[PDB]
C-alpha cells in the first residue's frame, strides 16, 4: 500500500513565478480552478504532500478540470503518468514545452494547452 501517514503540513518552495504546488484538495481544486471558461488547455502542475512520490498535471477542460498524479521521476523512467485511460508514463517537461502545441492534454478533448489563470 501507500496511503497511511500524513496529517497536517505545508510546503511551497518558490523563487520565481512557478506554478507548482503540493497538497491541494484536487476534489475542491476543480471547484476553484474549474471556474475558468477557457478550453482544455489551462493546465497546472501540483500534486500532494501525502503521496511521497506523487506528481499531478492538472487540466482545465471546457466542462471541468482534472488531476493526473500517480508516478513521478523514477529510476525506471521519468514522468510516469497518463490519463484516465492512457499510458504515457514517460518524459513530460521537455515534451510539454514543444508538444505544448499538440500534446496529450486532456483525455478526449482539446489536447492543446498553455497555462492556468489563478495566481499570476
Amino acid at each position: 500500500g501507500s496511503p497511511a501517514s500524513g496529517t497536517s503540513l505545508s510546503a511551497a518552495i518558490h523563487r520565481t513565478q512557478l506554478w507548482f504546488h503540493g497538497r491541494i484538495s484536487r476534489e475542491e481544486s476543480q471547484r476553484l480552478i474549474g471556474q475558468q471558461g477557457l478550453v482544455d488547455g489551462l493546465f497546472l502542475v501540483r500534486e500532494s504532500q501525502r503521496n511521497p512520490q506523487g506528481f499531478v498535471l492538472s487540466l482545465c477542460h471546457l466542462q471541468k478540470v482534472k488531476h493526473y498524479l500517480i508516478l513521478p521521476s523514477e529510476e525506471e523512467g521519468r514522468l510516469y503518468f497518463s490519463m484516465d485511460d492512457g499510458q504515457t508514463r514517460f518524459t513530460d517537461l521537455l515534451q510539454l514545452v514543444e508538444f505544448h502545441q499538440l500534446n496529450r492534454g486532456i483525455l478526449p478533448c482539446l489536447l492543446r494547452h498553455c497555462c492556468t489563470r489563478v495566481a499570476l
Binding site: 503521496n51 499531478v56 498524479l69 508516478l71 503518468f81
Partner: peptide
C-alpha cells in the same frame, strides 16, 4: 475503487 486521481485512482 476508493480514491480518485488519474492514471488510476492513484
Amino acid at each position: 475503487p476508493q480514491p480518485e486521481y488519474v492514471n488510476q485512482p492513484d
